[PDB]
């Protein structure tokens, strides 16, 4: 989209309609005349346009007002209100931009942010901008968390987030203009090689892909039309549904085979009844002929009964011969009708074992995208976020995604190697207990007005806990934590000192031998101008490979590659890295997924701040004090970098609203 409407679209807003959030801050406007609403929308869209046109610099209220034509600049209060609203909610003036108005010298309020991945960093920048005192506590010796790059010389390879999933409506589009990420498109051509190392003809590839898509569509029918979402009081998983659909297709193949062979028998039976008639008729004819001869041998002269006998038998014989010729005509029709059926059998199987292996590659691919086996995904909600996908091609950060968090960290107060152990939140304030990761005896106490927790869902799930909340979190929250899924997936980085593969081929697949092992090194990426290959480990394989040494993993990789490019070809790698996100105590998995038994609503529950009870009995309802962000807290964009970024922007706005108060809601 273009113009002011493009700005709305790029900000994930409907251009011609006010949002729920906007209603809450502009109740006077949304409940008033349509014309006023249109004025508001234009001011909002235009303000967004100005910011998006040049996000490398702070868009001020004055700057905004100066670039609105009449009569829109004829209501300065409304403009100021809209501006503060957008600014507060992070729709403008987020990221890294050179500021015009210096930061307020005296700060207001103290916030401790747990974790310095993208959600934490984004929130910190916002809070600092709003004038709050902010400190981030990070367990690792680095920033960016699940955004982890690997460097040696010029070789650069992401072990964590790697893809920017389309720029249309993506906040990373603004970030990419602010930071100098080198974005590169991803050619979707992906040849596959069977376990024996020989390539898959692109006949099969297409057919199997189409079937894979047809099967997904089929599970959606099972879910929405037949309401097949519960089985034995248990939520149905995508895996289960697919197994059912496949079994039904196998059943149909056998049902058709049966009806085909039954048509043959039915016809085969008509034939035998006709043949029996013919055999009996031939006997009758053979007998009549003999009689007709005996009659014709009574030489004339002859009385009229003798003559009658000859003529009579003659007629009866011809009549019967006519009957036989008719039946012989029918015999030729049935005989040919059989050579037709015998030549046209219905298909033999639903899937040849080769077909099934290739199909499993596609499932492995889906298991990789969702970082979890298909048997764990909710059939009803696994794709609940599909309607919010961005437009444009998927891209990779050529110079490593870490450039983003590293940049976002500039000028923030971050305490590295500080692992939070306990979070105390009271009517009067919070205190956070943390230790030094390099010598656990060293203890730190941080007092603040509010705590923003961006601990990964994997960490929140840890049992026994890694981080203790005092008082314990309420059941509505802990249950949401128990219900949601936290997946896993791994990468193997193979650095060579020379190329040996097709450099224009962006990525290619290895088709596993069995279903069990479908996710084992099923895909290889060739992503940089550098000579590096990245191997993926997905589904059930992800968890198991983590228990296997690097050498055995790398050995398997080389074995696969030798099978594809030739044993002579592929040289020994210069360096290798294997990720193990599940074992990583600061992540304990890769990212969330909608588990069977869960739903999107759980993501909302993860987001809801906690407000402690009163310190003094009979005292008024406190302020909320414990807040949450992270990839696992944003229903519409979960499991991504943009999702984490948006979650931080959201909490920063909510915290600032709570402790600095809104100006803009009169």
């Amino acid at each position: 989209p273009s113009g002011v409407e493009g700005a709305a679209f790029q900000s994930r807003l409907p251009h011609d309609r006010m949002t729920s959030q906007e209603a809450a801050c502009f109740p006077d406007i949304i409940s008033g005349p349509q014309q006023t609403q249109k004025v508001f929308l234009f001011i909002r869209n235009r303000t967004l346009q100005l910011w998006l046109d040049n996000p490398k610099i702070q868009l001020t209220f004055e700057a905004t007002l100066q670039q609105l034509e009449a009569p829109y600049n004829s209501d300065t209060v409304l403009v100021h209100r809209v501006h503060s609203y957008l600014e507060r909610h992070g729709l403008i003036n987020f990221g890294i931009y050179k500021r015009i108005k210096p930061l307020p010298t005296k700060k207001t309020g103290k916030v401790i942010i747990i974790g310095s991945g993208v959600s934490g960093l984004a929130a910190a920048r916002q809070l600092q901008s709003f004038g709050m005192d902010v400190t981030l506590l990070e367990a690792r010796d680095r920033v960016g968390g699940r955004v982890a790059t690997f460097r040696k010389g010029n070789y650069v390879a992401d072990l964590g987030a790697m893809v920017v999933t389309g720029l249309g409506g993506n906040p990373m589009a603004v970030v990419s203009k602010q930071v100098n990420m080198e974005l590169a498109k991803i050619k979707q051509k992906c040849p596959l090689y069977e376990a024996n190392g020989q390539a898959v003809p692109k006949e099969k590839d297409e057919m199997v892909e189409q079937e894979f898509n047809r099967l997904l569509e089929a599970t959606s029918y099972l879910s929405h039309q037949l309401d097949f979402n519960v089985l034995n009081n248990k939520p149905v998983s995508l895996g289960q549904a697919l197994e059912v659909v496949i079994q039904l297709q196998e059943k149909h193949v056998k049902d058709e085979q049966i009806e085909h062979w039954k048509k043959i028998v039915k016809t085969q039976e008509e034939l035998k009844e006709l043949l029996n008639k013919m055999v009996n008729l031939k006997e009758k004819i053979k007998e009549l002929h003999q009689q007709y001869k005996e009659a014709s041998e009574v030489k004339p002269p002859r009385d009229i009964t003798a003559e009658f006998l000859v003529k009579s038998k003659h007629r009866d014989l011809t009549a019967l011969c006519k009957e036989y010729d008719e039946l012989a005509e029918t015999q030729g029709k049935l005989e040919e009708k059989l050579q037709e059926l015998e030549a046209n059998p219905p298909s033999d199987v639903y899937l040849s074992s080769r077909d099934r292996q290739i199909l499993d590659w596609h499932f492995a691919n889906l298991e990789f995208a969702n970082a979890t086996p298909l048997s764990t995904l909710s059939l009803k909600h696994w794709d609940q976020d599909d309607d919010f996908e961005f437009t444009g091609s998927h891209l990779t950060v050529r110079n490593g995604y870490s450039c983003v968090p590293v940049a976002l960290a500039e000028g923030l107060d971050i305490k590295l190697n500080t692992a939070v152990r306990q979070v105390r939140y009271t009517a009067s304030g919070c205190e956070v207990i943390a230790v030094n990761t390099r010598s656990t005896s060293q203890t730190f106490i941080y007092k603040c007005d509010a705590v923003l927790c961006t601990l990964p869902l994997g960490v929140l799930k840890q049992q026994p806990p890694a981080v203790q909340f005092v008082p314990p979190l309420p059941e509505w929250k802990t249950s949401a934590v128990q219900r949601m899924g936290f997946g896993n997936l791994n990468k193997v980085v193979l650095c060579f000192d020379r190329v040996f593969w097709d450099p224009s081929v962006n990525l290619f697949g290895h088709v596993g031998s069995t279903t069990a092992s479908r996710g084992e090194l099923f895909l290889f990426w060739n992503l940089y101008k550098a000579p590096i290959l990245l191997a993926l480990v997905a589904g059930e394989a992800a968890g198991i490979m983590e228990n296997i040494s690097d050498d055995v993993i790398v050995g398997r990789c080389l074995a696969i590659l030798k099978g594809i490019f030739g044993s002579s070809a592929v040289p020994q790698p210069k360096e290798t890295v294997v990720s193990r996100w599940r074992a990583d105590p600061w992540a304990r998995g890769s990212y969330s997924y909608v588990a069977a038994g869960s739903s999107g609503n759980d993501y909302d529950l993860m987001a809801q701040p906690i407000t402690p009870g009163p310190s003094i009995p009979g005292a008024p309802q406190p302020i909320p004090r414990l807040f949450f962000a992270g990839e696992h807290t944003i229903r519409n964009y979960p499991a991504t970098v943009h999702g984490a970024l948006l979650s931080g922007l959201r909490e920063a706005g909510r915290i600032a609203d709570q402790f600095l108060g809104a100006m803009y809601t009169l």
Partner: protein
């Protein structure tokens, strides 16, 4: 709205395959058995029909009588009247047969004969005797 084309999925099907842990394997084996059962039935009739065909080997060639064409005649010779009377006795109403037997008299000519000589050849009395056979 509906399942993708060629994919088959009824309420009834689904319930059967999901009723228990190995309901699917049961369904598929019970069909493998019905399938094997019907190919035994094919082999058997194929063999039955092979034998029956070899019984009709040679067809009805030695039994054909090269049949003469000969034109009509609206005149009734004594010979023909007697042939007809006997033909009626054997075949009854069947005008086509009676015509064929006499050889030179059309169906209409035969039908007429029935009326014209009904009296003289006690044709009703003859017909009632064909009816007792």
């Amino acid at each position: 709205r509906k399942p993708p084309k060629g994919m088959f999925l009824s309420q009834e099907d689904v319930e059967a395959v999901s009723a228990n842990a190995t309901a699917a394997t049961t369904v598929l084996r019970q069909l493998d058995m019905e399938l094997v059962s019907v190919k035994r039935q094919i082999q058997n009739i194929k063999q039955t029909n092979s034998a029956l065909k070899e019984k009709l080997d040679g067809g009805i060639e030695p039994y054909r009588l090269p049949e003469v064409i000969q034109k009509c005649n609206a005149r009734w010779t004594t010979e023909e009247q007697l042939l007809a009377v006997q033909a009626i006795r054997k075949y009854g109403r069947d005008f086509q047969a009676i015509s064929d037997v006499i050889g030179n008299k059309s169906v209409v000519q035969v039908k007429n004969f029935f009326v014209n000589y009904r009296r003289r050849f006690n044709i009703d009395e003859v017909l009632q005797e064909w009816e007792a056979e």
